[PDB]
């Protein structure tokens, strides 16, 4: 935004004014240049933001994509192995809901969780073009975007650095749509990209400090974009996500008439009262809070649902 009381200043720039007048115009132009310069950086940052926007809503979770991809023979499942695969996914998802905290004392399993992570996908396309590479001429394969602490835990004793520099293309492609694919666009409603090429049938790199890490046997980019971009700007880092987990608990259920009301030993939890208070039907359940603070839940709390005209 170009503010008022400074556009009227920037307007009459050719009028014979004073010095205390002509000395505010330079301030106005400095402000306008600062803003126009810092706006064009917003698109170069928004590209790196939108790419994570697209490369996050397109990726299934690892705990489901890995065990499936070990079942490619018999592409059509025969309605029985599918049941077993389901009963195995339902038990393998609960294994590694957080596979870098529950298993933090032992770093070896994390490299396995990453090796089978990178070997689970498929390559896209080999275009006849120049591609990202390190100094020694080994072509790169993938990227591993994380948070800043995942980098600190991975570069410590698990993932081995290989090289600290890489060369990358520095100019985009181009499409012009002129010649015979313009006539085809105006007369009919179609066009082809390399049209002139079928009618014939019928680039500089730059070394830049990066971090290229070996995983499995491939060469991947390991970084954390939450410092170069996303800092000092109020746009939340998309790699920080929210997980939902539905709990349920039973309240006041009585064990039916069977041998299901025992005691492990003789005289456990014996009260001084002349009768046993455990025999009576229980009415409340007790769980732990977020901060480990014992709470209560008795039948009185369902008075909002069981005592209503519905």
């Amino acid at each position: 935004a170009i503010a008022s009381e400074a556009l009227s200043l920037l307007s009459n720039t050719y009028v014979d004014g004073t010095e205390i007048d002509s000395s505010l115009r330079i301030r106005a132009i400095q402000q306008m240049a600062r803003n126009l310069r810092t706006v064009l950086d917003s698109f170069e940052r928004g590209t790196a933001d939108q790419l994570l926007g697209v490369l996050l809503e397109k990726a299934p979770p690892l705990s489901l994509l890995s065990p499936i991809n070990k079942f490619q023979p018999e592409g059509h499942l025969n309605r029985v192995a599918r049941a077993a695969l389901l009963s195995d996914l339902k038990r393998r998802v609960c294994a590694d809901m957080f596979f870098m905290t529950r298993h933090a004392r032992e770093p070896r399993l994390i490299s396995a969780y990453l090796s089978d992570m990178v070997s689970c996908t498929q390559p896209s396309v080999m275009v006849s073009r120049i591609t990202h590479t390190n100094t020694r001429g080994r072509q790169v394969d993938g990227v591993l975007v994380t948070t800043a602490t995942l980098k600190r835990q991975l570069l410590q004793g698990i993932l081995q650095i290989d090289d600290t520099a890489a060369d990358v293309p520095v100019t985009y492609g181009e499409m012009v749509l002129q010649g015979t694919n313009l006539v085809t666009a105006l007369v009919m409603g179609k066009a082809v990209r390399g049209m002139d090429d079928v009618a014939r049938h019928l680039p500089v790199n730059a070394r830049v400090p990066a971090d290229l890490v070996i995983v499995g046997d491939k060469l991947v980019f390991l970084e954390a974009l939450e410092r170069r971009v996303y800092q000092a700007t109020r746009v939340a880092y998309p790699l920080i996500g929210n997980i939902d987990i539905t709990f349920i608990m039973p309240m006041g259920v009585f064990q039916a008439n069977s041998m299901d009301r025992y005691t492990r030993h003789a005289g456990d939890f014996s009260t001084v009262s002349e009768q046993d208070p455990r025999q009576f039907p229980p009415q409340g359940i007790f769980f732990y809070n977020k901060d480990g603070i014992l709470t209560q839940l008795t039948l009185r709390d369902a008075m909002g649902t069981i005592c209503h005209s519905s």
């Binding site: 803003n35 928004g46 700007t233």
Partner: peptide, 19 residues
Amino acid sequence: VQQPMIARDGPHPVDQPVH
């Protein structure tokens, strides 16, 4: 101090630079 910003699109509000 001059802070950077990010260009987004969708249901968000457009941004402007701060000083």
